[PDB]
Ligand binder design. Structure first.
Ligand code: ZN
Ligand code: ZN
Ligand code: ZN
Ligand code: ZN
Lengths: 63, 63
């Protein structure tokens, strides 16, 4: 939960770091990778929590 | 990467539970609040790592 050093992996594959912040309209998701995000995007999946259809994925870094 | 252990709070204001992922030039910064981002946005600050002038902020929730 820390604002630093918490460079944790994905929530589905969990093999790779959480580098792939996802956005659906005006809100987004944390703790999933670019791979898992790209997969759910190609499938056009409505978010498993927010239920919103995703729009984009970005290369995500830390301070 | 699944339980409550993924808050990723503020890093400048006070360390409060708020979230606010930032996106500049198709790349982005995670592990700060909406106020952290808004503060550096209005001051038009070039990123302390990427050196890019920031463009967007969104409510980025976790599992
Ligand atoms: Zn993954
Ligand atoms: Zn969502
Ligand atoms: Zn803050
Ligand atoms: Zn940056």
């Amino acid at each position: 939960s820390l604002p630093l050093n918490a460079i944790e992996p994905c929530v589905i594959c969990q093999g790779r770091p959480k580098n792939g912040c996802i956005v659906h309209g005006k809100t987004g998701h944390l703790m999933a990778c670019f791979t898992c995000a790209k997969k759910l995007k190609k499938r056009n999946k409505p978010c498993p929590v927010c239920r919103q259809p995703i729009q984009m994925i970005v290369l995500t870094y830390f301070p």
